[PDB]
Amino acid sequence: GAAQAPIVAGHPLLGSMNDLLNDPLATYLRARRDHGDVVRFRAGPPGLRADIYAVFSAEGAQQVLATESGNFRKDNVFYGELRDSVGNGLLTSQDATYLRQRRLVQPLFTRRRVDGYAGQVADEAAGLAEAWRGIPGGGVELVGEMHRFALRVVGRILFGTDMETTFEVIERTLPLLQEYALKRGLAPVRTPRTWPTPANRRAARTQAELFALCDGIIDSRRNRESGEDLVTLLVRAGNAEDGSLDAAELREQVLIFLLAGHETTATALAFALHLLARHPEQQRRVRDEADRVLGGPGGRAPTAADMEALPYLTMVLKEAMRLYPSAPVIGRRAVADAEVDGVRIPAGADLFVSPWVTHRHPDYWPDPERFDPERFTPEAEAGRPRYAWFPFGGGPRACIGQHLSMLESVLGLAVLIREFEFEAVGEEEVPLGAGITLLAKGPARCRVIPRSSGPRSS
Ligand code: HEM
Ligand SMILES: CCCCCCCC/C=C\CCCCCCCC(=O)O
User: Fold this and answer.
1) 166 with 213: CB under 8 angstroms?
2) Which parts of the sequence bind heme (predicted)?
3) Can you list the positions of beta strands (E) in 299-402?
């Protein structure tokens, strides 16, 4: 009964190669509009790469990530390039290797443990507010500012008091390593990393610098409510059935927490603020809520308990992640033949599900380009399929850092909203690109007007 997937319209020789280089996100949206919810992207010339399938329905995303998750593995080439760059930690590992890591790391990400990091988030957000009050011109570029803030937040939680000493190195090296692996990962032709090309030599130096830094911090904590940092918790990980992580395993988990938690949260934070800067009525609503909860400009630090008291900001962040999903595609590889929405996905095919497309699917989202936090009332959520929204994925390999990201984002943004008015400036439309991560192709310019002189004793 299963139909052949339609080939997305492209170049007669080169298939979708030029369209995916120039504008992948528009290409994905066109693919759904013209060809349906299960499609295939063809490369050219023939033989360069097998056809890549895509699944855009909420039902199909649930099937691939959850219902039939065992048939859709992390066997894409780009996963192997990530393993080669950061080790085979929680995001890339599979089978028994993954089950050991999950048993050892899931305890570190209980709601209560993650909540204990609220003061680190609050403190870093107060530090950013102090920095912004200090800008003579009152102007920022939100992509860059949130890239820096999000790394400081995840660094504080991983390394505590040692965040400041290691920040510069991670800030400079981590992005270069990710670019090398993901660009290698998506390229149909690549060199062995053993070739001494300039790019391989540059990558090997960067990897060596970052590995030595991580190894030193980890070895320092190997001697080991609680404000304990996450590497200390990783060093302490263990149970009656699984012994502790070794040095190689500790390094691979520290690197994946940084990689998986830095730019993802940064993108959500930047665009939430940019959207509020372009939508004053929604900004007024979040300000009124933050002022009620924290007692206005110059008021108190937010706490973990305040998450339940900031529902509107929480809806704002969900809507920002609907429109600007940090993982716009999620890749898998089919083991055996499958059928999604009456369409065949053959054994061995690479495929992707797409928060980008599903978050804009007209079947689930009226006026899908419109920014509307009220889409995330409990009632509005019940009126759409479960996987209409899935920026953190879903099922057995869903983001372990979802709640942490929301603690960082809700508490961090509440401080900034308590302390600044945001005014968009310049070109307010931000062009986007994408690989497996969302790419800002323009600035999110913003004027930040202080609401107070900052903290004052009482
Ligand atoms: C808004 C921010 C974030 C987004 C959009 C996001 C997105 C995702 C997605 C889509 C996945 C699933 C990938 C797949 O199924 O192949 C994932 C997994 C993961 N994320 Fe996040 N993430 C975010 C924040 C964080 C943070 C702060 C951490 C810090 C620990 C983190 C760590 C991870 C890890 C370790 C995994 C692998 C989980 C597993 O396989 O069990 N993420 N993330
Ligand atoms: C791993 C799934 C394949 C692509 C989906 C992306 C979802 C995984 C998590 C986060 C987004 C990007 C993947 C690499 C993590 C790095 C974080 C980043 O810089 O985006």
Assistant:
1) yes
2) 399
3) 330-334, 338-340, 343-345, 350-353
